[PDB]
Design a protein around this ligand. Sequence first.
Ligand SMILES: [Zn+2]
Ligand SMILES: [Zn+2]
Ligand SMILES: [Zn+2]
Ligand SMILES: [Zn+2]
Ligand SMILES: [Zn+2]
Ligand SMILES: [Zn+2]
Ligand SMILES: [Zn+2]
Ligand SMILES: [Zn+2]
Ligand SMILES: [Zn+2]
Ligand SMILES: [Zn+2]
Lengths: 340, 340, 345, 345
Amino acid sequence: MKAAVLHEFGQSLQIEEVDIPTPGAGEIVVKMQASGVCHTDLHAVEGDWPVKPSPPFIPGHEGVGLITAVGEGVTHVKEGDRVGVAWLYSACGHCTHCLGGWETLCESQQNSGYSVNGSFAEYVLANANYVGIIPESVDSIEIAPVLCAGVTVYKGLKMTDTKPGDWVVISGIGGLGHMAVQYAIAMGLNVAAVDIDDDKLAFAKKLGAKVTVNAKNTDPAEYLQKEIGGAHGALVTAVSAKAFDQALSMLRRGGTLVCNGLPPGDFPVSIFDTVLNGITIRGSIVGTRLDLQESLDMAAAGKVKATVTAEPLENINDIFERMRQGKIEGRIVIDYTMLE
Amino acid sequence: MKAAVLHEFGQSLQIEEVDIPTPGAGEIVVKMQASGVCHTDLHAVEGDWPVKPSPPFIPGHEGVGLITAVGEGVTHVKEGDRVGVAWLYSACGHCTHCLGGWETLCESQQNSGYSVNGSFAEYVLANANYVGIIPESVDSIEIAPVLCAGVTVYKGLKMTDTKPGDWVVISGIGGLGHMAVQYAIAMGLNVAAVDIDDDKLAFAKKLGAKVTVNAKNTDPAEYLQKEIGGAHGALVTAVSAKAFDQALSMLRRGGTLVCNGLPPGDFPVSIFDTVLNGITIRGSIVGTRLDLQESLDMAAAGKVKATVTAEPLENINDIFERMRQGKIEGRIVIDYTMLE
Amino acid sequence: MKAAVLHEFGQSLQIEEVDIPTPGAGEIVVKMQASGVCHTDLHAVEGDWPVKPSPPFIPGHEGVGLITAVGEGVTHVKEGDRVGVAWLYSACGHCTHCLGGWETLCESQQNSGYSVNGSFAEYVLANANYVGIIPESVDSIEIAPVLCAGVTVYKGLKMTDTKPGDWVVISGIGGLGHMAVQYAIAMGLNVAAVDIDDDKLAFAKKLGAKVTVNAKNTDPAEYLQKEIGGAHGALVTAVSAKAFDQALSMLRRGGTLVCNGLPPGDFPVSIFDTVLNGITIRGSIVGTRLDLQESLDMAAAGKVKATVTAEPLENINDIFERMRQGKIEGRIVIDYTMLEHHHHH
Amino acid sequence: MKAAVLHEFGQSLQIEEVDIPTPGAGEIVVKMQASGVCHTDLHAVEGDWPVKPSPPFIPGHEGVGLITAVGEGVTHVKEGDRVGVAWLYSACGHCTHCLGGWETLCESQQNSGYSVNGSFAEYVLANANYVGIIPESVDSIEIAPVLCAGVTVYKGLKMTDTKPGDWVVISGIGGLGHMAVQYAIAMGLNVAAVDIDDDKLAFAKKLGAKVTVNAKNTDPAEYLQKEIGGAHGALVTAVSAKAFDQALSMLRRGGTLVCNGLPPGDFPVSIFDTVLNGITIRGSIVGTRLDLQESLDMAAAGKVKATVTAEPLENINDIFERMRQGKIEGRIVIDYTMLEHHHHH
Ligand SMILES: [Zn+2]
Ligand SMILES: [Zn+2]
Ligand SMILES: [Zn+2]
Ligand SMILES: [Zn+2]
Ligand SMILES: [Zn+2]
Ligand SMILES: [Zn+2]
Ligand SMILES: [Zn+2]
Ligand SMILES: [Zn+2]
Ligand SMILES: [Zn+2]
Ligand SMILES: [Zn+2]
């Protein structure tokens, strides 16, 4: 089967031939129709993070396709079912985290396209108990980004501890952020969108953000303090020092900021004002099986729709380069019927 | 009446004579039996913080005493009632924070012994709707610190989002921390105490902390990771950079760190690890009327007891000096029957 | 000033002349532009409930108007401000319930148009700390029902412990229920509406209910168990024994049923199944000051709109007779600028 | 192996010989050291409930013993590990309930000693992912009741939505109730115990209940309304109509009642007052794997200790007869090392 393989961190991936896997007990093989690509896949192939892949490996944790083989003992899915291969490839199922519905925190979890081969190949070996069940009505290319961007922003909004009618700021209206506006609206929130690109901000308004502000033209924190009295919640999708700090300043007292991705390093942080104002700072970066199901249902109900561009597998190094310089709009999805 | 008056930030307070106030509508005058002193009074008299007192003023926000006059329209308390004058002097009662039981966040709150005269005088003018109602059974000197330290650590423990049977770390077993260990036990938590003083740590163990570690002799984080698998929550009572950072490292994934006081400045912060591990950082520094009532009931039930030392008002500058170099043990309380 | 006064339980109210009150400390006087009417006013004037009014009294707990006098010490509102007089007239502000944001539970509360005079008069004396602050942009007649129906169904939906994407059944799509469907949609819920009137159910669908069932034609519980796998939550706006029991049966395991009004009596209840299925049964019947503010903001955002019919004060006994036989649609609101024409002789 | 087998509902169980099972994938066999016995086993063997066992079957859902065989693919436990066989034998792992940490609600769950063979035999085949992990330090006979009574009352107290310093009433201080008082104390709650037996009530006080009331001598509700201003929560361990109704009356407004077991039938219920007072009624009858783990940790910490009486397997019909007339104190546990002495002829 065709796969994009990373042999050495920071090298181009090689489209090459590899064996189709076969499933052991508890496993399935899924033939990919589509695979999302995101910045996480870029961190994987550059070996950026403290805990790294072991090359050679196949990246990708946003695969949609049909089950072509079922392993021993699997009964809740079957051949022909359409499923999703997401970041959480497996978890132990016995620890305090797994037992309490927080399997995203399991210390022995495996991650698709990172600690094991992923969705950048024509076929993927998966743990049947951890794949997403894809709703009937949806398109495979369009739904793929829900498996990563969608579930992420959705769980991240839940982690803002906000409620219908509250105001949430979405900082950064890119790959994640355009999904975040949509989930926030579906969750009955009023949205304030902040970015530095005017078109992104128009897109946000079209997706239902009643307030927008361009951080390059205007102090976002002064404007939102005056306009909405400060946000109840903030979801920071592009974590740079400045966006984080501005997002803190955009909150009312008792507000919650959720960092929805990993910044590159530490960066100084208010503390003093943070405690005075009863602020909460939390990370949230993926979602549980149930979060992913809820995410997918919202999409199937038409409440959320990803902007995608479909490309052949062969373009994956080009795609990374464009990513390296924020040239991507919406999300990029590999389409496995594009036979170059 | 006798009062300790601050005329100029950073100068000695003068014990001097001032008029006994009389109460307008909604107010009461309380003759003090006791007044706690804490670092917040020190920040008030040094004019350390961004928003400052307007000298000349009388500090103190931990006064216990008997009502001697009642203003127009006050019916729920009356002459002779023993009440507590705490940090929260008043709040607006109309804003979203006040209406939802978060009056500690009210943007037009007044603060005793900071924005208005407080408990470092023989009598105090107070808003009848914001004083604490002192339980029958308790001693006035002993109960005073509940009005500031006790409520603070109590609400702080609530804000760790822990539950009975969880492990909480109390970092710093000093004025606040020794009360914190007791509230944590009363709330069914297992307590790990960290400090750098061996006697403080023995005291903690005597108050019910099953685990103790001296941060000077041992990496506290490595030790608690191995010993208890990481704490579910951390209450940081002495906020220096190093204690904060170590406290982060003591948490298990999904844990919550509450800062229970104000540090002096910003200080770098993990972020990256914080988000990866699904950690929450939160500030909590005082408590609502209801929190204060709940704090006081726990004390009256004998579940919590402050270590206090009673001193005459005249010693207040000496007391501040000893504070400036960590010479205080437990809490210091001004005793208004100590007549010089 | 003109007021509708109840002198004897169960008798017609008399439109008569009464002194305009003047405000003491902490109080205000509000000149009414509009007053909602509801079944709670009917229970009040019939003296139906265990704890009753003391006649003579002026009913009404859904008044919207402008402040015309401000008492001593009141500073957060002022003359000309538009405010709402609601069921919770006052609470003590000192008890556990009041301190914890649950003033609706205060054992010494007062209730507008029940334990003190209310909104069925051209002016009303009120406690300044308990009136609702009416958003700028709304109409006074249209907004009045938010003070009672809206806040009730809003807080009741919060009390279902559901979340966006969950399914809630609204049982009874009448005065309350039509507002309930709108709030439930604004709160990101999927809505299944149940009633026994087809037109009510069409209205519900128009308000965004994706699923509807006529309990007369079809077993509502069997249908919703098959169709949505059981609701996560149920809000019972018309509490008869049969609606209550069916609503229980419409829930999935771990679901929550909220009774949003007072039934007439006891009525047997499942228990056994309720405990087996991990079901929660809860009452929620009004809302705090903050719940009311949040309700009102939703309305002002255009997310909720009450169906109303405006009438002159002098129709209040006709209104109650219609109510006595389920003839009302939406809500009725007294409009203080509407006049009679007697067409004299 | 020796097993107590129920062949016909309502008949004596037969101690007879049955094959030791062998484990398939995902399964283990556990050699029992101890087995609790409770009213749920009695309902099972009488075939009392709407959904019943399929005889012949081996009852028991409180087994403690050592793994003697491990099936294919099992890695998180191993031979010689001490584990607990509890009511929740298995769940699907794939539905909304299972994925959200509410596996106790799973519609395709299996129940030990009810829908599959349980702990009334010397060996039990179990699903490795659902057995409890027994802390090192505890005794096997003493810990067995935690697997059923303990987890039940523990999760039930969590479901009262109380917090440390609140007042909870434990109604019925028997098998479940005497554990409930200990858990409630460990959870920082003040405890009011109610029952109709003075000795039970003294025991409760000894376990830390600072308030007690004998419902036969005194109106429990009037007393607790005066004494503590009404409880925040109530846990009803013996569900008869009268206990349930009195427990409702013991709550303050906004209070929560949890029914911790299954009454025999429906029984009228307040509603009207319930909704007026903002009261919540909830069933909670067992616990998740995590609840069970937490229960067990509290016991191992010395915070909770079950009163038990150890008996040989062969007494199981005698045990059920004593149960049939409330002759049991604390809990009964079968101890697999205990032997009869027939004193033969
Ligand atoms: Zn290769
Ligand atoms: Zn991704
Ligand atoms: Zn795990
Ligand atoms: Zn002076
Ligand atoms: Zn202080
Ligand atoms: Zn305020
Ligand atoms: Zn009404
Ligand atoms: Zn009150
Ligand atoms: Zn049992
Ligand atoms: Zn299941």
